[PDB]
Symmetry: D2
């Protein structure tokens, strides 16, 4: 069972319900728990940009409040970039079910960003489900092909070490980032309710509270 967090920015806010619905439909019966961090509607007082999506993703993943993050934007590129700017975050840009499958088996990342405008029309919510089914059902990182799973597992490790060298720890990032950006990123009405009970890292929880 995974704690899966959903984060949606203002350009695509009106699509949050649909996406949340696809996600709960697939992940809940699989024994996971879905947390909708919003935006819930385009009229939310607490508005998010794709940059905040990435920052929030970093908070959730590093704190243990989420095991996996689902996000995106019009094309999904913005949110991908922002998320990958964060320590400990490995965010794929996933389009189809094969992409999802391979992402899960080869890269075994902890976030995905998808397009919710570009290529998103009739039945796009059905592709979302197909993708969720590839990601959240089954063991991840077994590699494809399972034989070649060795080189891949190794490389993933080397990547983590490389990123450990480039990126500062999340707490440091929280202390040094634009503080209005940070406040905005966590300003959602349900944030406190969803986060604090699930946050395993006291220092992060303490810092964020300290903003009050």
């Amino acid at each position: 069972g995974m704690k899966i967090a959903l984060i949606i920015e203002n350009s695509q806010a009106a699509k949050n319900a649909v996406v949340h619905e696809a996600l709960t439909t697939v992940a809940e019966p699989l024994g996971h728990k879905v947390f909708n961090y919003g935006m819930y509607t385009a009229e939310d007082k607490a508005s998010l940009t794709y940059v905040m999506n990435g920052l929030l993703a970093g908070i959730l993943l590093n704190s243990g409040a989420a095991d996996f993050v689902v996000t995106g934007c019009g094309t999904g590129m913005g949110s991908m970039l922002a998320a990958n700017a964060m320590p400990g975050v490995f965010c794929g840009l996933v389009i189809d079910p094969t992409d999802a499958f391979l992402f899960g088996q080869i890269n075994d990342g902890n976030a995905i960003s998808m397009p919710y405008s570009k290529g998103f029309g009739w039945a796009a919510e059905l592709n979302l489900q197909d993708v969720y089914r590839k990601l959240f059902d089954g063991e991840r990182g077994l590699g494809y092909p399972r034989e070649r799973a060795e080189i891949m597992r190794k490389n993933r490790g080397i990547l983590r070490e490389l990123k450990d060298a480039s990126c500062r720890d999340m707490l440091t990032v929280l202390k040094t980032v634009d503080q209005d950006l940070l406040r905005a990123a966590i300003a959602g009405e349900k944030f406190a309710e969803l986060f604090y009970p699930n946050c395993k890292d006291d220092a992060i929880a303490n810092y964020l509270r300290s903003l009050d």
Copy 2:
């Protein structure tokens, strides 16, 4: 014009020639210069993994030896992840020409990673040309939809600040990363010839020289 660098890892080395040709076919007539960092063939003594492609991309972009990097792997995911792990690197995963277009206009990043196995069959080399045409011709960062242009321009800025806060400077990364991984990343037969005459950061050049 732009200095555009090509970097291919071992799983797709056999495709470096096809990718390079597509790339020079479009970029040269546009007045750009293409630097092929290899791998050139599956048999190259200096082999690259997708992690090294990312590391090498950070060296090239932060030193100024390249203005733009073209990379990838079977899916392009691995190189995307590694590249984006690096300071000052904003690497897109591009599939089709509309992806390319939007990347250029919304994100105005400095690298792209593409799949060279998945989806790669007939006329895939032509799609590559269509994508390069979108990327290397015209003004970037003008935004799409246009009504979202200012917001977008500002957000790119805010994103650069965010990453500046999260990532250490490239020179620091070089001194602190696995040193054998670094040596491997720059081991290419032609690395020196392509790199040093174009590097604008002496501290980086001199450090790599010291290895």
Copy 3:
């Protein structure tokens, strides 16, 4: 130059303006003439279904009133199936520019059907232009892969003979098709204006005229 006809059915009528603009932007500078047969708006009294799209394509191509037809629907599948049920119509289902390029070089058909809902989001209208550029600029049927160029040229010919064996001439079709379907197909407010002056086949012009 070519005479290029645009046909849009009811589910996507709202998009006729966008498709029509992508089309003229590319085709006119290339020295082609574009004929918009509607639907122009979702508000048109003369409504078309995808079955009519195919029938009209047949009328236009066999009559010589058009040299190429651009149509579609939600997915483009309906209009494709309807277009291809007609004599002398070879309609491709095209998604991306490589598809378009390959269609022109291998099949050299006289119609295309494209999705106007599935996959149709941001910049979808730019992909349209990209596709048009591959279809309406340069020589057709030169083949890809180039080594199969003759084989491909022969096959197109054999295909034509096959369809000649299966399909009745357009005139016969017109005389035996559901007359209500046919009447609705040509009920468009601009049909006459666009058609008769370009129709090369008097027999077809005659037959339709008599239906008033």
Copy 4:
């Protein structure tokens, strides 16, 4: 279930085994029967062109020897065009699993043609299965969006009538097509074996034997 026929032309004959495997893997457990009419390899004596794929599809479908036909070519366009030239054949060009789903639900055709070269790279066989699961599991033509359901069902009928008007009966077609084309279409080593015991139209069976 259904009797599902697989037809592969020469440009992609080397891929027949992989396709047959994706299809059996999915379709059989679902209670269907898969009939592989070849080509089996690039070296079959009896070679198929995309034009024959279409001709053969009409034979199988109209004779009731198959309920559904799976075919294709490099792009799938040729087999699609040829298949659709035939009476009683409604062949979609399917790329992805959503395409497949919508086809089954909106158009409820009896054949599909897919690309076995364009876009067919690494891991392409996984998508094949994804597509087949959409096609061969569940009821068809229930519409999507179901808010256009009845409309959709009405239109398919209208389309079948239109095509009845345009295309000649299959036996008339068999008597009037180039007879060498026809012979080559059914020259496959297992044709008789697969077709005859399943043909529900004696007049077609008789005519083909009359050859």
